[PDB]
Structures are given as structure tokens and as C-alpha cells.
A paper describes a structure:
We found that while Rv1045 encodes the guanylyltransferase TglT (unusual type guanylyltransferase-like toxin), which arrests bacterial growth, Rv1044 encodes the atypical protein kinase TakA (unusual type of atypical kinase antitoxin), which neutralizes the activity of TglT via phosphorylation. It encompasses an N-terminal domain (NTD) and a C-terminal domain (CTD). The NTD (1-181aa) exhibits an α/β fold that commonly found in nucleotidyltransferase-like proteins. A large central cavity is formed between NTD and CTD.
We observed a strong positive difference map peak connected to the hydroxyl side chain of residue S78 of wildtype TglT, which was absent in D82A. The additional electron density could accommodate a phosphate, thus we modeled a phosphoserine (SEP) at this site instead of a serine. SEP78 fitted the electron density of a composite omit map calculated with simulated annealing. Specifically, the phosphate of SEP78 is virtually located at the very center of the cavity, where it stays in proximity to all residues inside the cavity. The distances measured from the phosphate group to residues G62 (motif 1), D80 and D82 (motif 2), K189 (motif 3) and D208 (motif 4) range from 3.9 Å to 6.4 Å. R76 from motif 2 specifically interacts with the phosphate via two hydrogen bonds. The molecular surface analysis of the TglT structure demonstrated that the phosphorylation of S78 may not only influence the local electrostatic charge in the central cavity, but also introduce a protrusion on the right-side wall of the cavity which can potentially block access to the cavity. Collectively, our crystallographic data suggest that the phosphate group may inhibit the activity of TglT and in turn the toxicity. A fragment 71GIPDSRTSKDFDTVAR86 from wildtype TglT was observed; the calculated molecular mass for S78 was 184.9984 Da, matching the theoretical molecular mass of phosphoserine, 185.07 Da, confirming that S78 was phosphorylated. To test our hypothesis, we first compared the GTP binding affinity of the phosphorylated and non-phosphorylated TglT species. It was evident that the phosphorylated TglT exhibited lower GTP binding affinity than the non-phosphorylated TglT, which supports the theory that SEP78 impairs GTP binding.
Residue numbers in the entry: 4 to 292
The structure:
Amino acid sequence: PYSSPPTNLRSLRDRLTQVAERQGVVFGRLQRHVAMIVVAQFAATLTDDTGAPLLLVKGGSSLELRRGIPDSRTSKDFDTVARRDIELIHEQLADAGETGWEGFTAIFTAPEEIDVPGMPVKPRRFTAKLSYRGRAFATVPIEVSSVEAGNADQFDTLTSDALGLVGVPAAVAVPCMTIPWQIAQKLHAVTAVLEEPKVNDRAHDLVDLQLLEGLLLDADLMPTRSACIAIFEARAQHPWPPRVATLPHWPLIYAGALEGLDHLELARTVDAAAQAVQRFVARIDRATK
Ligand SMILES: [Mg+2]
Ligand SMILES: [Mg+2]
Ligand SMILES: [Mg+2]
Ligand SMILES: [Mg+2]
Ligand SMILES: [Mg+2]
Ligand SMILES: [Mg+2]
Ligand SMILES: [Mg+2]
Ligand SMILES: [Mg+2]
Ligand SMILES: [Mg+2]
Ligand SMILES: [Mg+2]
Ligand SMILES: [Mg+2]
Ligand SMILES: [Mg+2]
Ligand SMILES: [Mg+2]
């Protein structure tokens, strides 16, 4: 177990190689996970004047934090929800990246807005160029979206020991959007009907929705039902409860989304996945306050 932090990039990549092989994961998956953790630590330093998070992590990065690399889909985006205007978010991140964290620094590209149907303030996308001790390390796509209903009223705090395993001991603690709101948002996305030039490709959300249902265990579903109502009404598109339809090109997209998850108990076909998620929708709608 390394007693000092990596003295340079080459030492860091070499150490990541060894832990990846020891853990039986793909090197590039572990390296991308570490880049995401670093970006998340920068985001965790962003706080209002009472000390509460300004940014909550969501999406595939959140699921990898909750379940670990072996039990989560491979994803690349670092999706977040902000409680402040994004022009404030970008500058605060750029400040945090210059100061750095445990030898990591980052520079952020300019934010570009994205068109959306159902939120008045459009999300933003930019990239983080990471370096470790002066030398470029990795790039992370970043998406920042605005709060919806109560989806930033609370947060879970997740961790990862990946950097500790390579000799960087500082504690990792990442504020994340809670599961009820992740479910609401993925249920809306996976059932959305997009206009004629576009087509919904989000079969992978059917995998994540199965994973999120498992994470809720025997919890009461009332908070999830409430979150689902709030998001579907907030967006004012298709109504709650939706129909979990599959599109003709989804069979192979869903199969792609299962890559590396053979050891889990998941629906193995897109039809069975849609059936599972439809049962979850009905069970959510049933919950009685
Ligand atoms: Mg706190
Ligand atoms: Mg989500
Ligand atoms: Mg995602
Ligand atoms: Mg996968
Ligand atoms: Mg996002
Ligand atoms: Mg709430
Ligand atoms: Mg908050
Ligand atoms: Mg659809
Ligand atoms: Mg709950
Ligand atoms: Mg559909
Ligand atoms: Mg097929
Ligand atoms: Mg499986
Ligand atoms: Mg069921």
C-alpha cells in the first residue's frame, strides 16, 4: 500500500494499472472513475453561505458511486444539478480547478446551452481538462442543469476509496441527488416522445431504473411517487403514470447497456426490461400516503 502520493502522472498511471489488475477492472474504467472523483471534489467545495452544496451529482456517475464500478454501467458524463445560476457555477468551478486538489488541477471550457422541451432554463455543457502535477491527465464532459421542484432539497453523500488505493488519502465525499428524484427523472426521460428529427435512444435508462429499484430495497415508495408527480407536472409533457414502450431500434441498444453486468440479476431482453420497469411504475403509483 503506497505510503506517499504519486510523484507524477507516470507514477499515477502506473499505480492505477496495478490496482485495476488487482481488482479485475479495465484500466480505462478506473482512470475515468478517478477523473470523475477529482471533478466531484472540485464540485463539493462549491457551497452557499450556510455551507450547503451548490451542486448535486446525478446520472451515471451517481450510480457508479452508489454501486461501485463492477455493478454499474460504464458512462462518461458528469451530470449535476445546481442551486445557483450557471454563470456563477462555471466561474466557481474554474476557481476551484486552478487552486486544485491533492495535486490535481483543471481548466474548464466555455459553457454552451442546450435546447430542451420542459425546463425553462436550459442545461449547459462544457469539459474539464484535468492535469496532475502539471501534466495533462484526462478530460471529463460536464452537464449542469437547473433545479426542478424539490430535487435539490436534500442529498445523499457518497464516497469512493479509489484515490486512497493509489496513495492519495484525502477523504472523498460527494453530495448526490437522492434516489426518488433520480427515478422520477429517468422515468420521464425513458418514456419521452421526441419530435420528428430526433428519436429517443435511452434504452440504457431501463438498466439504471432496475438498479435504482433494487437500491430502494423495502423502502416506502411515497417520496418516489411524490417526486414522480412533481417532475411530470413540472415538465408539462406526457402525463404520469406513463407507458414504458420500447422502440424498434432498442433491442441492441439495451444489449449494449448490459455489457459487463452478467453477474447481476437483470432483465436480459429489452421486452423483459420494459415489463419490469412498468411493474415498478405501477407499484410507485399504488403507494398510499
Ligand atoms: Mg452537510
Ligand atoms: Mg439521474
Ligand atoms: Mg445517465
Ligand atoms: Mg454496461
Ligand atoms: Mg445531465
Ligand atoms: Mg424531496
Ligand atoms: Mg441544498
Ligand atoms: Mg418513447
Ligand atoms: Mg425514499
Ligand atoms: Mg416509450
Ligand atoms: Mg437483438
Ligand atoms: Mg445480469
Ligand atoms: Mg414489482
